[PDB]
Amino acid sequence: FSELLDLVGGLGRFQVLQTMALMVSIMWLCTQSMLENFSAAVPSHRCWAPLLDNSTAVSTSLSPEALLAISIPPGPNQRPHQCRRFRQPQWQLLDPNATATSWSEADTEPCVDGWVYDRSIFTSTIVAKWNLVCDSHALKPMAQSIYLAGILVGAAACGPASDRFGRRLVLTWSYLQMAVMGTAAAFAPAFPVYCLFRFLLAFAVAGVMMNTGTLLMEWTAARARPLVMTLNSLGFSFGHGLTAAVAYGVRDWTLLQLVVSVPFFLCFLYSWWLPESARWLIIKGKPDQALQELRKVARINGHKEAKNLTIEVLMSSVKEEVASAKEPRSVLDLFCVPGLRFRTCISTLCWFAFGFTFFGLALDLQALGSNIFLLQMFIGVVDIPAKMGALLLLSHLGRRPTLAASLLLAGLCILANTLVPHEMGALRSALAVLGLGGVGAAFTCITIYSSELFPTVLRMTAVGLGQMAARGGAILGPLVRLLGVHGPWLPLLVYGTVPVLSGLAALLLPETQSL
Numbered sequence: 295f296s297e298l299l300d301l302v303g304g305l306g307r308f309q310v311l312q313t314m315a316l317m318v319s320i321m322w323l324c325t326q327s328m329l330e331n332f333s334a335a336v337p338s339h340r341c342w343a344p345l346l347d348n349s350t351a352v353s354t355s356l357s358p359e360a361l362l363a364i365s366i367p368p369g370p371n372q373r374p375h376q377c378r379r380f381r382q383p384q385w386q387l388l389d390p391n392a393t394a395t396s397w398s399e400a401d402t403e404p405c406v407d408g409w410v411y412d413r414s415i416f417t418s419t420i421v422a423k424w425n426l427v428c429d430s431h432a433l434k435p436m437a438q439s440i441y442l443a444g445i446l447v448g449a450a451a452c453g454p455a456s457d458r459f460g461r462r463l464v465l466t467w468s469y470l471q472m473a474v475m476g477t478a479a480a481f482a483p484a485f486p487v488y489c490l491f492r493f494l495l496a497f498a499v500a501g502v503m504m505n506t507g508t509l510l511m512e513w514t515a516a517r518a519r520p521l522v523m524t525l526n527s528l529g530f531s532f533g534h535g536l537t538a539a540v541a542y543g544v545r546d547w548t549l550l551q552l553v554v555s556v557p558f559f560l561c562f563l564y565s566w567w568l569p570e571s572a573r574w575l576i577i578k579g580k581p582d583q584a585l586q587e588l589r590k591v592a593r594i595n596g597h598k599e600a601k602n603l604t605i606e607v608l609m610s611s612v613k614e615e616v617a618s619a620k621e622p623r624s625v626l627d628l629f630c631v632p633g634l635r636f637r638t639c640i641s642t643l644c645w646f647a648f649g650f651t652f653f654g655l656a657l658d659l660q661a662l663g664s665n666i667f668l669l670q671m672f673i674g675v676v677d678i679p680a681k682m683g684a685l686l687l688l689s690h691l692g693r694r695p696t697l698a699a700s701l702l703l704a705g706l707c708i709l710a711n712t713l714v715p716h717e718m719g720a721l722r723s724a725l726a727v728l729g730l731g732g733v734g735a736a737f738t739c740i741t742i743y744s745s746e747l748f749p750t751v752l753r754m755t756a757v758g759l760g761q762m763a764a765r766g767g768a769i770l771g772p773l774v775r776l777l778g779v780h781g782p783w784l785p786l787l788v789y790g791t792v793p794v795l796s797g798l799a800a801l802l803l804p805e806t807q808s809l
């Protein structure tokens with residue numbers, strides 16, 4: 295194909311504008327995923343209780359601390375309990391002579407009158423709106439899992455649709471569905487409905503990701519292609535910083551979700567001015583429409599020689615693309631061939647670890663340190679040099695040691711974060727930030743390495759299985775957080791162990807650098 299791009303302009307004004315336009319959309323798309331660090335933050339809470347919260351009652355001389363100690367019992371954090379209150383005010387507990395056996399469990403009851411939440415950091419969150427606390431606490435990671443399952447189902451449905459209807463049509467309607475479903479999720483009347491709309495938003499997020507990447511690859515001349523995928527990968531890195539920047543200003547979840555959704559109406563509107571993939575159009579037997587797209591890009595780039603193209607030249611020079619329809623293949627072909635079984639297993643395990651680890655950790659920053667705005671910023675700011683350093687080492691050291699060292703770095707940081715005591719919040723923050731940086735570098739490595747481990751007709755299928763395994767692992771990410779009832783060390787032990795085991799597995803892969 296590339297000779298037509300050479301004649302039309304292989305990296306010109308059009309590709310520059312298109313790359314910028316698609317990067318910006320990927321930034322906002324990243325915010326949609328990272329949002330529920332802030333949209334679903336857990337403010338500290340207690341039961342509603344008469345002496346504290348009944349402002350219509352008769353006045354009293356006692357200070358707030360005394361009233362609180364008189365009304366809500368102590369809990370595991372050496373602080374007021376978040377799910378229980380005294381059945382009647384424990385005036386006896388005010389005296390300095392008091393002891394812990396002055397009351398018993400029979401003196402307590404659950405939050406019959408509901409909960410009171412701290413409004414100092416966030417004005418509202420879904421947790422505060424629908425009381426996703428105490429016996430309902432599991433519903434938050436469930437909501438996150440339903441979103442990520444939406445991405446899996448959407449990626450599965452995108453393939454057939456992308457090949458049947460085209461790259462740009464599916465991209466356009468995905469932008470529209472993101473705008474509409476995000477706006478609808480902002481105004482959901484009940485929690486099940488919020489889950490439904492987040493699922494339907496995720497279904498479209500998958501389409502935007504896949505077709506953004508594909509539509510760049512089908513319009514970029516090969517000499518510039520690695521750079522374009524690098525910039526595409528940096529879009530997510532800038533998205534983390536943008537999430538922190540937006541969420542620091544908009545402290546109200548409905549307004550925050552709406553604010554990050556509205557941009558996709560503009561993305562929808564400008565996706566009509568992009569061209570459809572010329573490869574796809576010729577492959578599907580529509581060469582006159584392909585000629586229109588090619589002459590349009592030539593007009594934007596300013597090449598005078600647009601007269602040199604004809605549908606005969608297109609059909610002659612793109613026949614080697616058209617011929618690709620001859621040979622279908624299946625995922626079983628990866629496991630039937632005696633040697634490729636081992637490569638497939640280990641490669642797929644690496645793809646899983648990035649998904650399981652990244653979306654396990656990056657969606658509960660509130661557990662990693664004292665300030666979640668700076669944490670969300672830094673898992674972008676560190677992501678940038680991690681990705682660039684990964685490319686450098688991946689060029690000079692080879693694929694195998696770079697992937698292995700990256701995953702082991704991630705795993706050992708996350709595991710060390712179990713041992714560092716809760717007093718040292720800054721060091722805990724730093725270790726978790728470095729862990730997520732290593733996970734990003736590992737994503738960079740495995741994307742490239744999986745494109746080299748396999749014979750060229752199975753290459754696409756191997757990467758496809760890998761990406762669907764990453765998406766499938768992301769679903770299990772948040773669910774593993776439910777193990778926290780046994781202590782916060784256990785979820786972190788799992789999130790740390792998976793990348794160590796897969797890193798040591800990657801050491802068994804064969805090196806693919808030419809020498």
Ligand SMILES: *[C@@H]1O[C@H](CO)[C@@H](O)[C@H](O)[C@H]1NC(C)=O
Nearest residue numbers: 343344345348349350351352
């Ligand atoms: C709140 O205080 C008013 C004072 O008149 C009282 O009538 C009402 O029953 C109280 N309600 C609760 C739940 O304490």
Ligand SMILES: O=C(O)c1cnccn1
Nearest residue numbers: 527528530531652734737
């Ligand atoms: O590079 C990243 O951070 C990334 C890429 N695709 C999906 C999720 N995350």
